[PDB]
């Protein structure tokens, strides 16, 4: 009848599942120490309070951004490459890639930790964009993310050296389309033979609707604190919910797969390089 976590691990161990697509959100990166910009308590939260944000998500809305770009660049400074390391969840996905199982990893996060963990760019869809590149909001000139880093770290809003427009990192804001690579979902999701969903509430579209794009025979494993989204209201017969702390669900799956010592070796060697 209903599949267990051990069942999914055995499908992988028996090579019944070969082509895994992964969807992840902010829950996989809280163990790295990244503070939720919405939650009272952190220095990030306190620094955002000095501004006229009517509500936290205005940090990703263009009307607010053009009125006052400083809250967004306060978040950019916090999240810019180097301050945070990937954690066990990212390295599980990296080991999954190294073991030849990763068809594609779709992420909603903008912390860049998937690529830092060493997953190749070709295997990643950074569906909500990236700080790796930036674009002038007026003249549309592109820039390497490194080119605005000095300004961002000095608390200066980066300006375009040709037209003086605000230069905006290529983060997808509410109301904007997702990146071109998002369209890989048209060929990836029919090819997948297992879907993993980690650390997300599935509250943002069109990302969340991807859960419905796998074939009906394909198991969907959710590792998350709560049952969520299209899995809560359109349950399918091969769905599996591993409810609880994301890192502990990942550790349990890693042990069932037979990967624990290998994962610890990978994590030691990688976090050491950083």
């Amino acid at each position: 009848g209903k599949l267990s976590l051990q069942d999914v691990a055995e499908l992988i161990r028996a090579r019944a599942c070969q082509r895994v697509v992964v969807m992840v959100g902010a829950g996989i990166s809280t163990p790295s120490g990244i503070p939720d910009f919405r939650s009272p308590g952190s220095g990030l939260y306190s620094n955002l309070q000095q501004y006229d944000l009517p509500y936290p998500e205005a940090i990703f809305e263009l009307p607010f951004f053009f009125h006052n770009p400083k809250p967004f660049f306060t978040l950019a400074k916090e999240l810019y490459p180097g301050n945070y390391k990937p954690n066990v969840t990212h390295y599980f996905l990296r080991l999954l890639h190294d073991k030849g199982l990763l068809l594609r990893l779709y992420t909603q996060n903008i912390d860049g930790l998937e690529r830092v963990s060493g997953i190749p760019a070709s295997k990643l869809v950074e569906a909500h964009g990236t700080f790796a590149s930036a674009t002038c909001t007026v003249c549309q000139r592109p820039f390497p993310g490194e080119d605005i880093r000095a300004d961002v770290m000095a608390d200066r809003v980066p300006r375009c050296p040709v037209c003086t427009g605000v230069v905006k990192p290529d983060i997808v804001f509410f109301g904007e389309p997702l990146p071109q690579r998002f369209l890989l979902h048209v060929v990836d999701f029919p090819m997948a033979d297992l879907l993993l969903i980690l650390g997300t509430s599935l509250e943002v579209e069109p990302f969340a609707s991807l859960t419905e794009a796998v074939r009906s025979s394909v198991p969907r494993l959710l590792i998350n604190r709560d049952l969520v989204g299209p899995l809560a209201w359109h349950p399918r017969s091969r769905d599996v919910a591993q409810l609880g702390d994301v890192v502990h669900g990942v550790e349990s799956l890693v042990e069932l797969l037979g990967w624990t010592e290998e994962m610890r070796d990978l994590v030691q060697r990688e976090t050491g390089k950083l």
């Binding site: 804001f173 904007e176 990146p179 998002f182 069109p206 969340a208 609707s209």
Partner: peptide, 9 residues
């Protein structure tokens, strides 16, 4: 690119 980025609520 399946729609614009949007909050489900």
């Amino acid at each position: 690119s399946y729609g614009r980025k949007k909050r489900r609520q």
